[PDB]
Symmetry: C5
Subunit: 83 residues, 5 copies
């Protein structure tokens, strides 16, 4: 299984987006993530206020490892994987 | 063999492009893809309504693995590979 | 040795720039590549009219594998390697 | 554990940002990094004036390896990992 | 040790930046690099006229391998590593 998380520049602060409407609910909880819908968007998302680095470390503890990272617009995105 | 899939940000929702007009039709069918031609294009494309994460998880079951991910414009691209 | 190939978006269609004037003439021929200059082009380029995926697949048969992929401007670039 | 460092082009000169305010102070101490808040921000950043190459080599000695690199806007970002 | 090399699009031609002013002179010489300070730059840079592909191959000979590639602005950057 894969995981996509992102953050808007600057990377040193949050919030960090950690999931879509169908993300594993137990994982989102383990990260202290909340479900919300930002106005202007027509989809729900999970987020945490922690900067990306903090979230990457937490995910390592749950078995996820970073495969790739890229930028698009002013968004930094990380693709994680787990057997 | 390789596979290129993409999506425009936001990455939490679809649609997700999963093929060119020469794509393996059996795989496109297993992904639940549909063929269409956007206005202004002289070529067809396969796409699904599921967000990128869901599509990666499905491909992982088909034997694919993400080698790389990148951004170009407002588009997110994943290059997958299967032995 | 390394290889660099590219294409402008959309990624679904060609052409695909598969080499520079110093590229292996053998390799360029197995991929059905044609050399040329693009007016203003003080240099040459090898391309094929196939979309990136087709090309990536053919290069695989020749021992080349994708190490990295990135976007720059409206251009997608793949970096392949071979023992 | 993961580490995120960055720099603005040109990549040949500094400064290089080596951490947020929750960064390991011992590690920061070791790179000879300094803390400062830049006009426009509201949070602190650790940084060195050495260019990225020197920083990557210093981090290699500490057991950190580069997992990925990417540009976003005018910023180069490197994601490093350590067992 | 790490290495950072780059080039402006188009990637088919050079020059290719191969180092900063603190770069290993001995390594710079095996590449046949030259030193120069571009106007409007408060720093020196080592370059070669060879397009990226040739430099990548020359560096493979000396024990360097590509870890990541990315684009920032009109520049393509390669991060190479050597045990
Ligand atoms: K942020
Ligand atoms: K989308
Ligand atoms: K194209
Ligand atoms: K800089
Ligand atoms: K160039």
């Amino acid at each position: 299984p894969y995981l996509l998380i992102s953050t808007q520049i600057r990377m040193e602060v949050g919030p960090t987006m950690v999931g879509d409407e169908h993300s594993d609910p137990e994982l989102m909880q383990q990260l202290g993530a909340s479900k919300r819908r930002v106005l202007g968007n027509n989809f729900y998302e999970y987020y945490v206020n922690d900067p990306p680095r903090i979230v990457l470390d937490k995910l390592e503890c749950r078995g996820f490892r970073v495969l790739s990272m890229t930028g698009v617009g002013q968004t930094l995105v990380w693709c994680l994987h787990k057997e």
